[PDB]
Write a protein that binds this ligand. Structure first.
Ligand SMILES: NC(=O)C1=CN([C@@H]2O[C@@H](COP(=O)(O)OP(=O)(O)OC[C@H]3O[C@@H](n4cnc5c(N)ncnc54)[C@H](OP(=O)(O)O)[C@@H]3O)[C@H](O)[C@@H]2O)C=CC1
Ligand SMILES: NC(=O)C1=CN([C@@H]2O[C@@H](COP(=O)(O)OP(=O)(O)OC[C@H]3O[C@@H](n4cnc5c(N)ncnc54)[C@H](OP(=O)(O)O)[C@@H]3O)[C@H](O)[C@@H]2O)C=CC1
Ligand SMILES: NC(=O)C1=CN([C@@H]2O[C@@H](COP(=O)(O)OP(=O)(O)OC[C@H]3O[C@@H](n4cnc5c(N)ncnc54)[C@H](OP(=O)(O)O)[C@@H]3O)[C@H](O)[C@@H]2O)C=CC1
Ligand SMILES: NC(=O)C1=CN([C@@H]2O[C@@H](COP(=O)(O)OP(=O)(O)OC[C@H]3O[C@@H](n4cnc5c(N)ncnc54)[C@H](OP(=O)(O)O)[C@@H]3O)[C@H](O)[C@@H]2O)C=CC1
Lengths: 445, 445, 445, 445
């Protein structure tokens, strides 16, 4: 069987590029899919009551046709992201609608409109084949992927590709995602695998790490500098588990927000010291459905100042959205920045503009990362400066359960998924660098 | 009488600096004031039902003691600003609340905590006296004032003085404003009077012109460049009457929003062609008290694209606030900027964050201007590149009516006020430059 | 004959996309070429004694194979650039070296490694065919080109493509340039043709205009704002002319430097008023081959201040290099910027660093433009805000003489070349916009 | 004796603000001075043969009159800076030329135009008296002083005070410097003393730490971010000993250049790993005295790449000037920044502009720091994130020897000077924080 021979060559460690080019491609591959017919199955239920285990299937699907500028990748491991969860509960809309509408553009785009949607927006693995015009990547190259799919035909993205008007999120607005044994990506999504990490660890930072890097570190986001005070909501989640690391590695002070003493201890394990538990404080920023309580804004602001010696934060790392956003704007220092990439609790934000203009603050929208920012974020991982935050790993066959844990907030850092990898622990080729950092690497386990 | 002697010297033309130094200072001056006792006379009434004529008094007040780094200015003219309106209807709080609590600091700021409040945040006039440490300005100098009052003892303002924690607005959070025959200002508020303008014209740009300059032109605001498309709310109001000029003079395209065809004609007189009447289009961005209508946002966005050839705006010049802010965020181009210095219609903003993060937009809060920005804005006026926008002039005794007109929105550009100047038309000393630009200078009359 | 039928289709004005798709591609096309065998013919000669008429041949060459993301363009007109002239004298090295070495990379790059090299880095024309993966452009589209050729496989260019490490300049480091009846370009080189211009006018701004735009207008260069004073060396040259237009269109003040009273008249024709004749002033910035004369820097600075009312320039637009650079650093305002894209007089620059650090100045290097900047620069042409500067037009068969003209600086404006266009004056489809700007369009004739 | 009673009050540790206010001011104070007579004395000699011990005098000088916004400070300790060395060798120009022509401005600045010059640009001590208009600082306050003297009457400095046209360096371009028992400073030079440091340690970072902070960390300089590679010339000198710390604490990689293995060991003690010894490597960047050797530039570049895994530096921290500047421009990464605040080896820089424009690099001039940058730099010291780098301390009477050591390169630290402090080791009031950082605090000893 051809898939087993691909895995055997990977595990062998001796296969050269010519060997991979010679290996026969399988005729099908195992993939975690949504089914088009079942897209209304959660109709009328509440969001908590929607169960990804009901809609996620394990299918054998044919290999898509390789186009120019693309690579076929044998996937050793992937991860669950929030966008995967939303996809699995057909929220906010069935991902199938875009796939069909986009597919009518050209024959190449049409490959993605199918009765099934292969999900997954992270990958770690090995290049099998490359389409026409590809020089920078060869069969056998060990890779991770970022999830930005840009065509770059418009000039708009040529000073920062996040401005491309035709940007899709791989595995979400494209098919052939990474929760599968094989994946199709553009070669400009490919990055060198950090050699000191396992397959599942290498696959875990991708989406959240690059997002946090752009949002906090890069000049396209908050432009952090050493000495800054930074409020980090959700500091032990996927995004926060990288944002906290960037604040500390950058010489800044994180004020970490968590919802349980258990999460607080992980932040201390990361090296943070100023930690706020939103439950124990019992913040109620909203009096009712339509009115906020500035007394509760001010109470958050006083709690921050206890940790900073009377200083207000230079940057708020936002993502919870409507519930917290009025407080985020209020507590930010004169001249400071609220940077936002999400609105988990609701996207209709309300805030008092007097604080924004009279104190010269700014709200900066950020989304994923361009290839240079993705490369820089992955490079900091490769250098041992930023660490994966895996808490639990599931086999591909159990992806539905992994999605539900994330949906219900059962875990802390990243939830990983094995794909072709037969067990955890494989893929390390820099044991010296790994052993220097193993304690941090395992801090979320 | 010593006030007449001061005016006669100014009107004369050959008074040297020594002559002004030798003039006797009056023991009192006429000023437009609020009265501490009356500070709640409008409590219980509705916003449109407070008439500033009820709360604005013409009193004779003693001269304050001159301090270090300050100047006593004989005021030839001033203007009404919206903050003057807000002051006169003791809304949102009595300006006395500030004055009172501050004066407890230093005996110098204590001079401002009085039972009356001399209003006014613009001036054009002549320096009479300077306090200790004043080298750049001398008696007899023709000046306009910007309204930034900064102490600059804190380090915070030394990379942009707007960030000074003690940054106040002169005549609003300080006493001895410009709607009076004399005023007290810091000498770092002083700028050279544009020689081609009359006293009342020279006093009209100060507050709104410098604010629009920082908001739209400077790198501390939207950083406009030629080719940009800029949506300008209230394009024929105080702020808009300068923002439109900066867009056109900078090589950009303003899309001007007004509420009457009469105001549309002024915008065409300024050189603009893309004009939207919000009354005629009947935008109703809010369905009910708590929900907006995204179909109305899209309708604005389509109308803009009719003027731009399918392009979305790079910058939104905001200030109306809650009524328009959701639409402003929606219509902005991917990567664009919404810049806001106010919220006339309500400061509790609501917007859909999905548009802000998924299209990488930013909301930038802006407030007045630092001295360098104020100087640059006044310099463009002095060079004839930006023109005053006076529509109507009142005598000092009629300031109450001037404020009512702005309160109810009877006027268009700036409403000016004569102080010591006995009639309009005085104070020009560069007649050739004035003749070059008079048609534009008079565009709002 | 197939080439004639392509031209007939273009001149007809009613050919639809499907019509172009069905046209027969010729077997050969006529092209201006260098010959590998002759690359040593000028060895031993001074630069000004090398004659491009001796090295430039008119050949019939076969059509290259169309690759992914590429377009075959029927070229109506092109222009002579400085890089074309240098290539024609095999300076600084022969262009064949790069074509050979680069051709070793892959079969696609090998297409360019030929015994002949078709030169030309500007184009205006009509798309004939597009390779695999192209949806933005289609047969029949009227285009101009920018000359940046980037693969974008490296992440480096994904936040500003000028940072791409393996960039080529089309027609200089690639084959199939624009001085020919057909050309091969990447589709990410294509821009919409300005409809109000003729073929030869539309082909003229490209390289020099986008370069000046990035250098002066964009935030990657000097970030011009209205009110700035800008010193522009060679203000009537190819580059200095577009810089002068950008200064004026953005509301800044150019201080134009020229070498003759007739060149001063060109600057006045462009709308500039502050003009300095370095020949009349007799500046000798260098006392000998190794020592500069600071008293001559000072003389330039005083003369500048005569035009600005005592103000030093915010920006120096540099390109002459060693001769002028010390003076450019000297005269720049405290906090100002010297932006440089060339060193025509010599690339070993000498300056007094005391002025740079003690007055907090910066020198910013700039080079060509990314696709977004090229689009914005061409869009300002399409809007009628920036105008082509054609001074003389040659037919394709006379390209050798056009190159000599540029080599000996016989013209102040761009030198254009007709390719397929049978005469000047064709290709206008927005005659109303043309009429409005006709006098400016012809200012360099 | 009044001076002795001031020192006793400080050493007692229980003197209140009112006790300092009641202390009798001395009528003279001991100071390190230059003499305007001794003006010319080193002319005709070479730089190394200039002995500061001949030109630096220990005189008794009368107290200057205190002005508005100023403070008289009892100086416990100071430091030697390079500007002290340049002052003492009257080189390039005499500092008297500054002092002298200035004071003819205002009677307040005229106090500084004296026949002697009290040197010193750092201080740690205790406020004794404040002038009119001072609220933020009071007698008894423990302070360090930054050396920025700005008048701020001009608007130019109000968006970054370094742009004030009257910006000066206290103790170098002004009188009453800190190498003395008393000093006169503007209160906007005052910063809170770090409580965990001794007087001499607290005085040592001021000038070079704030300069390195602006140059490397702030957005007004290089804008460092974690992951950047930074080449740091003179990494164990004054400036470099802070620049190296900022690189490491901000998550970047310094490539440190020193001239002895002993200095290399200190860099390793600071936490750096990539270290280049310029003497051992034998770089000779200048062929003759008018020509450089690009083979030597390339050799440095390959040495850097050995440390970075083949990456070129994002930032070069320059200050040696002519000898190294050509290399610095060459080795910088494409799109990178060379930031320079000095030219120790000669201010006539020469560099190859081809590397700057073709690789889109920039040279950014930087000079000291504004009050906000100085506050942020001192705050990082106060938080124990940046440490002082004292190597040796001299008594006030031996300042000439201290100057000579820096002039010839005998030491590596900052070299500190006791003023009123009778011995080393006094002034710590936060011993717990000191203990946490003592090993790093003493790394240069
Ligand atoms: N490129 C983009 O634009 C990206 C967006 N995303 C995100 O997708 C989702 C994933 O974020 P991710 O970190 O991976 O998911 P996680 O669940 O792993 O972490 C999110 C954290 O947010 C906190 N949180 C949730 N709700 C609230 C609330 N109402 N108030 C305060 N805190 C709250 C929780 O931390 P705790 O309970 O401990 O307080 C939670 O753990 C987000 O919605 C965002 O859209 C992610 C990557 C990229
Ligand atoms: N932070 C700062 O430094 C400064 C703030 N301010 C301003 O005070 C307030 C007044 O500004 P100013 O220009 O002098 O006042 P004006 O009244 O002169 O102009 C404001 C314009 O806004 C328009 N407008 C008013 N209400 C609405 C609405 N509900 N929706 C849409 N448009 C509306 C009106 O134009 P039309 O009806 O024709 O559409 C009006 O002309 C500004 O909003 C801001 O607070 C001013 C200067 C500085
Ligand atoms: N980096 C890039 O992307 C680009 C660079 N270029 C440059 O093109 C060439 C120069 O630009 P371009 O304007 O098109 O060429 P032009 O010949 O059309 O103009 C050059 C101008 O330089 C002036 N000049 C030359 N030498 C001196 C001197 N010693 N002192 C003062 N002025 C001098 C002359 O002014 P005189 O007329 O005073 O009156 C001349 O007009 C270079 O080769 C360079 O490559 C061009 C396009 C792009
Ligand atoms: N603009 C501003 O505000 C400031 C400027 N300065 C600068 O001070 C001087 C440097 O400051 P500072 O750090 O206090 O002085 P230091 O003497 O303490 O350190 C300077 C370092 O530069 C190295 N160096 C000296 N000469 C050369 C050379 N020819 N080539 C390469 N490296 C060299 C030396 O290290 P090694 O021998 O180990 O290689 C030396 O340690 C500058 O001249 C200027 O005065 C300083 C502070 C502020």
């Amino acid at each position: 069987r051809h898939m087993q021979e691909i895995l055997d060559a990977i595990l062998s460690g001796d296969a050269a590029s010519a060997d991979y080019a010679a290996l026969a491609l399988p005729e099908s591959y195992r993939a975690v899919t949504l089914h088009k017919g079942e897209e209304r199955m959660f109709d009328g239920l509440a969001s908590r009551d929607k169960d990804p285990r009901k809609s996620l299937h394990l299918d054998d699907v044919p290999l898509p046709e390789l186009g120019p500028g693309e690579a076929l990748v044998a996937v050793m491991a992937s991860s669950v992201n929030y966008n995967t969860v939303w996809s699995s509960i057909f929220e906010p809309v069935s991902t199938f609608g875009f796939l069909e509408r986009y597919g009518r553009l050209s024959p190449l785009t049409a490959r993605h409109d199918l009765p099934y949607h292969v999900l997954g927006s992270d990958l770690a693995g090995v290049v099998l084949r490359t389409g026409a015009g590809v020089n920078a990547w060869k069969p056998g190259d060990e890779v991770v992927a970022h999830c930005l799919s840009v065509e770059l035909e418009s000039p708009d993205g040529h000073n920062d590709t996040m401005m491309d008007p035709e940007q899709r999120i791989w595995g979400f607005e494209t098919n052939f995602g990474g929760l599968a044994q094989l994946a199709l990506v553009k070669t400009n999504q490919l990055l060198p695998k950090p050699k000191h990490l396992t397959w599942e660890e290498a696959a875990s930072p991708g989406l959240v790490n690059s997002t946090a890097y752009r949002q906090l570190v890069s000049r396209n986001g908050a432009g952090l500098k050493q000495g800054d005070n930074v409020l980090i909501w959700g500091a032990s989640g996927g995004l926060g588990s990288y944002a906290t690391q960037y604040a500390l590695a950058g010489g800044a002070t994180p004020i970490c927000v968590v919802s349980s003493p258990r999460k607080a201890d992980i932040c201390r394990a990361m090296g943070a010291e100023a930690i706020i538990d939103r439950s124990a404080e019992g913040y109620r920023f909203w009096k009712d459905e339509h009115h906020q309580d500035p007394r509760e804004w001010k109470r958050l602001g006083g709690k921050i100042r206890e940790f900073t010696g009377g200083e207000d934060v230079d940057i708020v790392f936002e993502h919870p959205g409507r519930e917290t956003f009025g407080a985020s704007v209020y507590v930010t220092r004169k001249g400071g920045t609220i940077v936002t990439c999400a609105s988990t609790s609701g996207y209709m934000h309300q805030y008092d503009n007097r604080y924004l203009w009279m104190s010269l603050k700014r709200i900066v929208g950020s989304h994923f990362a361009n290839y240079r920012e993705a490369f820089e974020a992955n490079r900091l991982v490769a250098k041992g400066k930023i660490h994966p935050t895996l808490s639990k790993v599931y086999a591909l066959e159990e992806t539905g359960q992994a999605a539900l844990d994330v949906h219900h907030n059962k875990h802390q850092g990243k939830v990983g998924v094995l794909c072709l990898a037969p067990r955890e622990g494989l893929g390390v080729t820099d044991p010296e660098l790994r052993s220097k950092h193993l304690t941090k690497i395992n801090a979320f386990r």
